[PDB]
């Protein structure tokens, strides 16, 4: 009943009948990305159109399409004709992806190359990589995938212990052409492996690590409802899945007595590059936008009970389209929990001899996606007290290279004759706020010091200071640690019982930003993440920092084109787009699997509850 | 047997006795201090000679003394007096804390400013706080603590939440004076209570909750040797404590296959500051030194299963000496247990077929101390990848005051009338390294940005550069989050198998540092807080980054001095000092009792091993 529910089997079945009986789904055709639209604004009136919207491509050359379909009224809304030349080119294939090895398997300039280094054809895997824009004029409207190549000694073996450096392929994946093959010489290929379940690499497995068993006797705390509607401790949510973005957290609101408020409209990773920074030609083209040109959805893992959740773990089993339209389950793809948090309040008063110890918990919403050689985790948090937090663990196999004789500032050496390129992982969040309701604010906070003087005579004093931004072409903000900066998103027609307006402070980890030259082709097309905070007017077309055709687009679009509008966003319908990324230098440690490592965020309320929200919590 | 075993019941006796014997422990005199010495640096002689350093206070105003103590021997090696007008005085002692309140309830100019208010005498409790060294010549080489009051309407009331603003005093707790009596005008004392244990406060406590049990069917996975010797996940240390500094963490070493690493010879918070940033003169004097001035390991909770503890609990029950030389035994004051902490390492390869997960775990050792109206958690974490974390835990009831009609640009208002001044919680960790040994060094590391043109023509290269700090008067160094600045410690003269330095890598969470006018007070006395790293060339008698006598020393000690010496740290014995703290501008729901706020620090390894050191952890 709710329009927030996962999209069902059924729904994608009968998107599939409408698309065909309208025509727009013969042999030659491909759903590139299918999803469900979120309610337009002021959907007050139960008048609910369960609508999705679809990426179709044309494996034989022919334009594709964009449509829009009701499911409610069995009917085509809309379907546009994309010039991809001028607005860019769809999401990645999965079919795409093999279509790559196979092609350079008969091209004479490869296997020259493959021949030189006396490399069994059959041994090579090409690594699918997507394409950019750059100095190629032959690539612009024509769908380009490069390719760099791993060997891969028997099946079972981790190709990317050996790269085969100073080689690179362009395939027009359409036309099936090989377009470039460019060759800057050889290196050895490196030669020692990196199976990290080989006995002779780990070595005798501990013994020593004793069972930790987490259980909940009588259940856990949460309950769901309409197959998505979460919940927990005072908190209510609606968890959805998108094949583009993921988990979506939708309604997330916190029950304050007798009220429902709203805290957070929709909270998503709109999107997440990693940027390569080592200037060989073989590589400098490498930029993955993860989200927008591969879709993280739809490569979720099933997640297992005992290894990757661990707990009275529930289950959520999202439906996503196959490329023909058939609806695909991916069993077990996200996670529900309750952990432990340890505590939460505690203090020993001398003068009344109470003493007082309350615990603390969170609620778990996890999925993680594997891309190639890299796995992510995405983990939303929610927190007794009102903190609402974002994590993505990064692991994996780290991308590699050959390490070159005499060295290089571009890349780490992590075995005899392997290196591993220097290169960044950014994300953006997409913040839909909805503080009390939709009339909200952005406040930059910095610490303000004070000097020794008249009123200040011991030279003690310090302060803060608050700046309302209040237009789009003043809210594009940077970080700064030193000043303790942080933003407050407010809502100046909902008051505390001090008069204060209610609000919620956003706390950045303050990481590096990108760090390409800001005229690079990556900073055009991932302008998004070279400031660490943007404010726009909400827009129902406004979904993600970097457009919707991420693919092979020439720059600009996304975020630097929305804010141009300068539109007002002081008291009202706001999103918040917040960077944040890692910076990776490899270390030795990180092969030949990486252990996790870690970024995020939190939000936490400032003044938005009359005092503490966790005085109702037992006492264990 | 071992050297670094925890102080015994029988040792503290044998010093009482050895200092009775020596007439330096009669009536008059109160042990302000006692703890055990480190052994020497080069003790593999096995000659063991347990040491203990006792501060000797003298309560009929003879001057203190300074005593080490060899219980091994039975004797006393040195006594020395000192002048504390010059080098300091000594800590506070927990009998001066009563003696403030009972001088003040006789003092007339106290009395009347309490008629005034029309408050009875019997329902104000005075705070005793440490008085720090302002403008008042007639406290040079006297005891001094300041009052400020506050208001317990019954006895099982929270005086906190009835501030007495206006009003502060000051008492020589030897002489049993009251030198000053300061009344700047009557504000009115806040009515509202802040009983969090009050059902008409809390309201019904919440039924939702269900149980999470964490058990280890077959025990932990560590082993305690010795009393406080900890081997777990080829982990080695010894749990130290003392009296000043609380949990002492020595000898920490990682087994490498066949060798024992050393990584830290010792590690510990050293100091740690709570200045207040008020221009009020009720409170512009207000700076806690915690660790020196009131060592916080006195004040240590008895932690309880359960609640502050929660899964299976290794205890220890550290003994520390009462003020005339008795043991005392603090039950359950040190926590002990594993915890899991989420995958480790994940990969699906599509190429080869595995499908790999493993999970982490952390050991956990942690105590609670409680000074007052503030509780904090110290959380030292192991984690099986090699990382070494520190946490701290801030909760507790905020310091208050009135909040001024017409507003405040130092103080929150939390209640009606009620405020709460803004504040800084700085700690200072001392890091005496010993990474493969003790010849070590630190490097200064930024991410460094390259400019698109020649060999970068595409613009999307970028680098680091490393730093190495000399000698100490170049070792003073700030945090950079912009341009991602951690530092290395290496041992330059011990390769891993690529012929690189190992080393270990220093993650900031790159907060503010001290905010007061460097002009200031604090700012003397705290000189360490206004920098993020220093590092020294490793001494025995330079402990505490403020000096051994912090309560009322007039600033300059500990590290500024120190560093002053200008001494070779390149490939040298050091201590790495890093400081780390919170800015807290009190929000509404840090009141009546503030949930958990926390910040650290992290160490990753950085080449130290020759790959990932937890390949054979097991497949759970
Ligand atoms: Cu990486
Ligand atoms: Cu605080
Ligand atoms: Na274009
Ligand atoms: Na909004
Ligand atoms: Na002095
Ligand atoms: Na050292």
Not at 189 to 202: K, Q
Not at 545 to 555: A, Y
Request: hydrophobic content about 35%.
């Amino acid at each position: 009943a709710s329009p927030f529910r996962l999209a069902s089997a059924g729904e994608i079945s009968e998107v599939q009948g409408i698309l065909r009986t309208a025509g727009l789904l013969g042999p030659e055709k491909r759903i590139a990305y299918l999803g469900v639209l979120d309610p337009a604004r002021g959907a007050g009136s139960e008048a609910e159109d369960r609508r999705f919207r679809v990426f179709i491509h044309d494996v034989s050359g022919a334009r594709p399409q964009e449509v829009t379909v009701s499911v409610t009224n069995g009917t085509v809304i809309s379907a546009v004709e994309l010039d991809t030349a001028a607005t860019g080119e769809l999401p990645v294939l999965e079919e795409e992806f093999e279509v790559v090895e196979q092609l350079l398997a008969t091209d004479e300039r490869w296997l020259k190359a493959l021949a030189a280094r006396n490399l069994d054809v059959s041994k090579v895997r090409v690594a699918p990589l997507s394409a950019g824009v750059f100095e190629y004029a032959e690539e612009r409207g024509r769908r380009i995938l490069r390719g760099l190549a791993f060997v891969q000694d028997f099946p079972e073996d981790s190709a990317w212990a050996h790269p085969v450096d100073g080689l690179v392929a362009y395939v027009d994946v359409v036309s099936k052409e090989v377009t470039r093959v460019i060759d800057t010489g050889v290196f050895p290929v490196p030669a020692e492996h990196g199976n990290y379940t080989d006995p002779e690499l780990t070595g005798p497995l501990r013994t020593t690590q004793k069972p930790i068993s987490i259980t909940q006797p009588e259940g856990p705390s949460f309950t769901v409802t309409g197959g998505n509607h979460i919940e927990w401790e005072k908190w209510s949510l609606d968890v959805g899945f998108d094949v583009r973005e993921g988990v979506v957290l939708h309604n997330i609101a916190f029950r304050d007595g007798d009220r429902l408020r709203p805290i957070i409209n929709r909270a998503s990773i709109a999107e997440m590059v990693v940027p390569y920074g080592d200037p060989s030609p073989i590589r400098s083209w490498q930029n993955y936008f993860d989200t927008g040109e591969y879709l993280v959805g739809q490569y979720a893992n099933s997640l297992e009970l005992g290894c990757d959740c661990l707990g009275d773990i529930t289950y959520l089993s999202p439906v996503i389209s196959d490329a023909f339209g058939n609806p695909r389950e991916i069993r077990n793809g996200i996670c529900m929990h309750e952990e432990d948090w340890g505590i939460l309040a505690k203090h020993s008063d001398l003068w009344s001899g109470i003493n007082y110890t309350r615990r603390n918990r969170r609620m778990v919403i996890s999925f993680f996606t594997t891309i190639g050689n890299y796995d992510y985790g995405f983990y939303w948090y929610l927190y007794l007290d009102g903190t609402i937090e974002f994590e993505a663990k990064a692991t994996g196999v780290v991308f590699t290279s050959a390490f070159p004789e005499g060295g290089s500032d571009n890349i780490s050496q992590l075995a005899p004759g392997l290196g591993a390129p220097f290169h960044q992982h950014i994300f953006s969040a997409r913040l839909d706020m909805a503080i009390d309701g939709f009339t909200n604010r952005v406040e930059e906070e910095d610490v303000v010091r004070q000097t020794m003087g008249p009123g200040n005579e011991r030279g003690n004093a310090f302060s803060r200071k608050r700046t309302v931004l209040t237009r789009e072409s003043e809210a594009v903000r940077e970080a700064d640690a030193r000043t303790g900066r942080t933003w407050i998103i407010s809502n100046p027609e909902s008051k505390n019982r001090l008069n204060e307006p209610v609000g919620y402070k956003l706390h950045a980890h303050n990481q590096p930003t990108l760090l390409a030259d800001p005229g690079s082709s990556i900073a055009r097309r991932a302008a998004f993440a070279t400031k660490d905070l943007w404010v726009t007017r909400y827009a129902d077309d406004e979904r993600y920092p970097t457009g919707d055709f991420v693919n092979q687009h020439s720059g600009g679009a996304g975020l630097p084109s929305y804010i141009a509008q300068d539109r007002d966003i002081d008291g009202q319908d706001i999103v918040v787009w917040h960077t944040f990324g890692l910076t990776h230098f490899p270390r030795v440690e990180d092969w030949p699997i990486m252990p996790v490592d870690t970024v995020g965020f939190k939000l936490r309320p400032e003044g938005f509850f009359d005092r503490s929200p966790v005085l109702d919590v037992p006492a264990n």
